[PDB]
Structure 1
Amino acid sequence: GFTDYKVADITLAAWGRRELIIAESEMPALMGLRRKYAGQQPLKGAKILGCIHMTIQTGVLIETLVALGAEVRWSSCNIFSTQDQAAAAIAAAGIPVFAWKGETEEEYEWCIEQTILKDGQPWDANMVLDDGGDLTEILHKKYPQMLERIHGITEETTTGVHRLLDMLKNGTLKVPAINVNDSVTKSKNDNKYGCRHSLNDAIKRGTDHLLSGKQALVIGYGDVGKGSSQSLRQEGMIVKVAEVDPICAMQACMDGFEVVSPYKNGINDGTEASIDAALLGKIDLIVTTTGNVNVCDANMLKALKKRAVVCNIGHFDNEIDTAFMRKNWAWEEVKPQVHKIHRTGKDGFDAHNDDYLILLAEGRLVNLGNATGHPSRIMDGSFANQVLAQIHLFEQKYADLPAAEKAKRLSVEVLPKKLDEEVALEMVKGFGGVVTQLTPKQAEYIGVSVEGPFKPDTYRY
């Protein structure tokens, strides 16, 4: 008589389970952690609040935490990223989950709250797993007392890490965190190669547009912008790249991309005259990858080529000024998460109007909103890091320290390189790759152990 959940349709659980069984075969690092730690039950007595996209891959993460001894209560960190069959399979296994594809904002907040409250009262949670910092913010702001019991937070993504570092700087962070994002087997795997796989996937599913031969503008060239640019270039798009960071812009040039600004002289003074109208007038697709605010702004949207596609693969939808488009332009739904935005006015639209843009996932994370985000074999790296970060903080028991010792222990850290290498080795073996073992003389020659770590902590890969 398990009822402690809310999903779109529980009858999808058998389908969800079939896809979980396939995903386990694609996630050797994660499944290897189940075998390595199951006898030891290192998460026995852990009670984890989880807030991350309720996909099949998150399903395998959740069941790994449970196989290692944890109880969890789960929600998604985006209104469109849940795969309903994954949420169903998790609920049907007796696990509290509150997530469905197509939540309203109010439902999104309610879902987080159902993880935080059990039977109307704060759950006795002692760990947090977060992706974007929304659950972390709600606990700090609305349930600060619960953080007196919590041993740490493991944060998945760049945007969430920034918010943790803000709190650390301000002295408002109450528990230590692991920056899971900055493991190499996360940031340089998930953020880059994951978006390479899933950006053109989402655009094809949403529009079925030919990309070859067409003009794209990618805003940003960090890890997600690098992966996004490659996703489009390998399809034969002519890709241009915008950046505020000259080092990242240098890499885009060397990678064979023309680097341009939406603005004359690169100066964003807020006027229409600042827009390079010739440039925007040729662009068939714009993709925002920055984690910043309003990098595809109202004047850019006004200048864009008719029938251009607009989408965002950064964590939050405020990269694009969708508010301006809601206020001024008429939205025509093509199908779920695909809207034609008619620039002729707000008062209805001509069904045969040519002057529209196509917006994907209402500006929300497009790879998860219009497709299924990253594939299992990539999320294997990210989620093996999450499990190890959860064990790492849970075994250190920060919440049991006195305040003076807590202050010394409070930090936002990355996992040590030896663990990053262990995850990577399991990923490499999953491809059938064979890593070479150094001889003792060679290890001495370059100053490393035969067992690693193989690089100084300064190394950038």
Structure 2
Amino acid sequence: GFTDYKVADITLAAWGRRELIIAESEMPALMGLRRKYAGQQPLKGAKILGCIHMTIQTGVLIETLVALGAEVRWSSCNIFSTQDQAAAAIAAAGIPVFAWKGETEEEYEWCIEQTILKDGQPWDANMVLDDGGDLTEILHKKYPQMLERIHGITEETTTGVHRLLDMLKNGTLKVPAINVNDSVTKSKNDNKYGCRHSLNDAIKRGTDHLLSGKQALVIGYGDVGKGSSQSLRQEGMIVKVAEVDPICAMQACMDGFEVVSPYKNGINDGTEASIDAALLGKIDLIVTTTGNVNVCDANMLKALKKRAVVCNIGHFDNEIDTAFMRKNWAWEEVKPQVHKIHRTGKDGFDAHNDDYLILLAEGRLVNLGNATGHPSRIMDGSFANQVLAQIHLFEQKYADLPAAEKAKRLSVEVLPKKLDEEVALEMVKGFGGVVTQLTPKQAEYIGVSVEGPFKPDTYRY
């Protein structure tokens, strides 16, 4: 009689299990780790708080951690990203999970709290796995005593790493962390190619709009913006790219994109006069990818072409001034996570009004909100890194170390390149790719071991 969970519909469990069994065949690096370490049980004694999108892919990560000996308590890190059949299958396996698609903000907080508390008292957690830093933030602000027992944080995504680095800079980070994002088999796989697969996927499921021949503006051209621009361009959109980083803008130009600013001369003075109204009046689709605040602002929303689609694929919804739209314009739900925003006014709308925007996932991460996020074979790389980072920090046992040794180890680190390569090798074999072996003379010639690592730590790929 297991009841230590909360999900939308437990009867979806059999369906979730069927898709988990498929996903395992799409995840050779993660499953290779499961088979490699199952006998050693390197996570025996680990008690992991996890906060990441409760998808089928996260399901395979959860069961790998458990198979290596960990206990876990799990929530999603976004209100719309849970796949309810994934959550059901995890709960039906006797694993505490608190997640459903379509949580309210209040419910989202409650779900994180259900992982932190067991039977009304703080759980004796000793490890954290996080995506975006929400669970990390709640622990440091509301449950600081628990961090006295926690050996480390393994953080999934660019935004959460930024939050960790700010805490470290400020002296407020209480436990060490591994930046899982900046493994090459994560950042340059998940962040870029994941969004390539899943951005156009989400726009199609939400609107079924033809994309070919239409105009797109992508705000940002980091890993997520590069992959997002590709997602649209490969469908035949005419893509323009905005950037504040001239190196990233240089890449956009060389990649065949016109680089433009929403603001005249690139200068936002906060008034409508600084908006490039002619440019925005021609845009059919705007996608924010920055990790920054208010990069699709109210004046931009006022100027967009009628019936433009607006969405965000960065971690948080404040990339888009949705608060402005809630205050001033009338929202018509088309179907879950698809809203028409009628720019004619606040109090009601004409069902046949033509002056509206279409907002996807209420500005939340659109690939997870309106589709299923990244595919299993991409998340394979990210979640193999997650498992290796959990093992490394749990084995280090930071919480047990004397104070002077803790001080040596209070940092935010990445996994060694050798492990990055071993993850990548299993991914390549999943495609049937064959990696060539250096001869001894060739390895000597370029100064590497036949076994790698093959690049210096400075290398950017």
User: Structure 1 length normalisation: TM-score?
Assistant: 1.00
Alpha-carbon offset, residue 281 of structure 1? 0.2
Alpha-carbon offset, residue 121 of structure 1? 0.2
Alpha-carbon offset, residue 12 of structure 1? 0.2
Cα distance per residue 1:276-322 (max 9 Å; x no partner): 00000000000000000000000000000000000000000000000
Deviates further, 405-414 or 430-439: 405-414
Tell me how far apart the structure 2 counterparts of residues 26 and 408 of structure 1 sit (CA, whole Å). Answer: 39
Alpha-carbon offset, residue 74 of structure 1? 0.1
Partner of 1:273: helix, strand, or coil? Answer: helix
Aligned to 1:455: 455
Cα distance per residue 1:32-87 (max 9 Å; x no partner): 00111011000000000000000000000000000000000000000000000000
Alpha-carbon offset, residue 89 of structure 1? 0.0
Partner of 2:311: helix, strand, or coil? Answer: strand
Partner of 2:79: helix, strand, or coil? Answer: coil
Tell me how far apart the structure 1 counterparts of residues 76 and 403 of structure 2 sit (CA, whole Å). Answer: 32
Aligned to 1:126: 126
**Counterparts of residues 135-284 of structure 1 (less than 5 Å):** 135-284=135-284
Alpha-carbon offset, residue 413 of structure 1? 0.3
**Counterparts of residues 393-408 of structure 1 (less than 5 Å):** 393-408=393-408
Alpha-carbon offset, residue 408 of structure 1? 1.0
Tell me how far apart the structure 1 counterparts of residues 408 and 440 of structure 2 sit (CA, whole Å). Answer: 39
Cα distance per residue 1:168-210 (max 9 Å; x no partner): 0001100000000000000000000000000000000000000
Partner of 2:273: helix, strand, or coil? Answer: coil
Alpha-carbon offset, residue 232 of structure 1? 0.0
Tell me how far apart the structure 1 counterparts of residues 402 and 219 of structure 2 sit (CA, whole Å). Answer: 46
Alpha-carbon offset, residue 155 of structure 1? 0.1
Partner of 1:359: helix, strand, or coil? Answer: strand
1:69 maps onto 2:45 in alignment = no
Gap regions ≥5 residues in structure 2: none
Tell me how far apart the structure 1 counterparts of residues 60 and 449 of structure 2 sit (CA, whole Å). Answer: 33
Tell me how far apart the structure 2 counterparts of residues 171 and 444 of structure 1 sit (CA, whole Å). Answer: 44
Alpha-carbon offset, residue 132 of structure 1? 0.1
Tell me how far apart the structure 2 counterparts of residues 391 and 404 of structure 1 sit (CA, whole Å). Answer: 23
Alpha-carbon offset, residue 402 of structure 1? 1.4
Partner of 2:290: helix, strand, or coil? Answer: coil
Aligned to 2:37: 37
Aligned to 1:307: 307
Aligned to 1:102: 102
Cα distance per residue 1:75-102 (max 9 Å; x no partner): 0000000000000000000000000000
Alpha-carbon offset, residue 454 of structure 1? 0.2
Alpha-carbon offset, residue 127 of structure 1? 0.1
Deviates further, 344-353 or 397-406: 397-406
Cα distance per residue 1:334-388 (max 9 Å; x no partner): 0000000000000100000000000000000000000000000000000000000
Tell me how far apart the structure 2 counterparts of residues 77 and 41 of structure 1 sit (CA, whole Å). Answer: 27
Aligned to 2:287: 287
Deviates further, 403-412 or 274-283: 403-412
Tell me how far apart the structure 1 counterparts of residues 250 and 158 of structure 2 sit (CA, whole Å). Answer: 21
Alpha-carbon offset, residue 260 of structure 1? 0.1
Alpha-carbon offset, residue 442 of structure 1? 0.2
Deviates further, 400-409 or 335-344: 400-409
Tell me how far apart the structure 1 counterparts of residues 365 and 401 of structure 2 sit (CA, whole Å). Answer: 39
Alpha-carbon offset, residue 404 of structure 1? 1.7
Tell me how far apart the structure 2 counterparts of residues 409 and 344 of structure 1 sit (CA, whole Å). Answer: 57
Partner of 1:432: helix, strand, or coil? Answer: coil
Tell me how far apart the structure 2 counterparts of residues 200 and 352 of structure 1 sit (CA, whole Å). Answer: 27
Tell me how far apart the structure 1 counterparts of residues 396 and 206 of structure 2 sit (CA, whole Å). Answer: 45
Tell me how far apart the structure 1 counterparts of residues 299 and 431 of structure 2 sit (CA, whole Å). Answer: 46
Cα distance per residue 1:382-404 (max 9 Å; x no partner): 00000000001000000001122
Alpha-carbon offset, residue 405 of structure 1? 1.3
Tell me how far apart the structure 2 counterparts of residues 334 and 56 of structure 1 sit (CA, whole Å). Answer: 26
Tell me how far apart the structure 2 counterparts of residues 224 and 430 of structure 1 sit (CA, whole Å). Answer: 24
Percent identity, please: 100
Tell me how far apart the structure 2 counterparts of residues 187 and 5 of structure 1 sit (CA, whole Å). Answer: 32
Alpha-carbon offset, residue 443 of structure 1? 0.2
Alpha-carbon offset, residue 427 of structure 1? 0.1
Cα distance per residue 1:108-130 (max 9 Å; x no partner): 00000000000000000000000
* Two-structure CA RMSD over aligned residues (Å): 0.3
Aligned length: 461
Tell me how far apart the structure 2 counterparts of residues 14 and 299 of structure 1 sit (CA, whole Å). Answer: 48
Cα distance per residue 1:122-178 (max 9 Å; x no partner): 000000000000000000000000000000000000000000000000011000000
Tell me how far apart the structure 2 counterparts of residues 337 and 106 of structure 1 sit (CA, whole Å). Answer: 18
Partner of 2:135: helix, strand, or coil? Answer: helix
Partner of 1:244: helix, strand, or coil? Answer: coil
